[PDB]
């Protein structure tokens, strides 16, 4: 995801066997420090979509933000009086689920005094979803193919942006938090909870979490879209043939072949305190066209129950994060980089030039 240079210094190597044994039990729910933005209500007619009653995926005319930690004006303001470690839900999810990751990724860490800022680099593949990343044989096609890893990633990301907004009541008033969105109908429906965690050892985490919508049971939702590109080429189970009759097998296949993507979504919901994880199932209209899609159905899971299904253990998630925090706190001020080795089960912490 980024080219290592000769002037980079390896601070520490963290292999997945070691990281999998970490545990930090007893971490409570995050405490809201500030809430802002406003979400639209979920459209429950989408719960009645099924394979025999498919719904075309619409193109939604909205801008989809991904603002990193140090560019967030709420985080900058809150940091004057709150916490000593700062990040976003998506950045934390990447770290917390690193032992499930296969494809390379990176996160920038800046230490300033006794404070840590975890950032992501914009317009990279950090903000793109992966497709069949954890299959025995991940997608192998080359550049131009619509089934290459990168084109599959662009497709799934586009699907997810459109789906999250389509299933909402767009011409109705929103559920408003106390403060306005710090970044701006022209924008994706989203509401933010800036939340605080006591991680012990003098560590207090402040991080931006989010909900995609609200729903009348008021329940807050994390909304994501699972996607099917070509089930035969993926060696999967065909959703149009199996969703109604073997729903458990369809999901089990998603758990194993998209393991990191689904775990990070679940962490996002757990951190924000979403009451429901809502999963759309979106498939191509035809297998050689990545421009047209249909919603085959929606499913709903309590995040804590889904975490159990996927063996997501938040004691380990927090343990991994505090391990990396503790190492960074022992370093001098400056810019650092953590990145997953493309070919090995490990992440490395580098000292990188502050101009990089």
Swiss-Prot record:
GO terms under biological process: cap-dependent translational initiation; formation of cytoplasmic translation initiation complex
Keywords linked to the UniProt accession: Cytoplasm, Initiation factor, Protein biosynthesis, RNA-binding
GO MF entries: mRNA cap binding; translation initiation factor activity
GO cellular component, one term: eukaryotic 43S preinitiation complex
Subcellular location: Cytoplasm
Location of the region described as RNA gate in the Swiss-Prot/TrEMBL record: 125-139
The keyword Cytoplasm appears for this protein: yes
Entry domain remark: The RNA gate region regulates mRNA cap recognition to prevent promiscuous mRNA-binding before assembly of eif3d into the full eukaryotic translation initiation factor 3 (eIF-3) complex.
Described purpose of this protein according to its UniProt entry: mRNA cap-binding component of the eukaryotic translation initiation factor 3 (eIF-3) complex, which is involved in protein synthesis of a specialized repertoire of mRNAs and, together with other initiation factors, stimulates binding of mRNA and methionyl-tRNAi to the 40S ribosome. The eIF-3 complex specifically targets and initiates translation of a subset of mRNAs involved in cell proliferation. In the eIF-3 complex, eif3d specifically recognizes and binds the 7-methylguanosine cap of a subset of mRNAs.
Quaternary organization: Component of the eukaryotic translation initiation factor 3 (eIF-3) complex.
UniProt record similarity statement: Belongs to the eIF-3 subunit D family.
Name of the protein in its database record: Eukaryotic translation initiation factor 3 subunit D
Lineage: Eukaryota, Metazoa, Ecdysozoa, Arthropoda, Hexapoda
Residue span relative to the full protein: 172 to 536 of 558
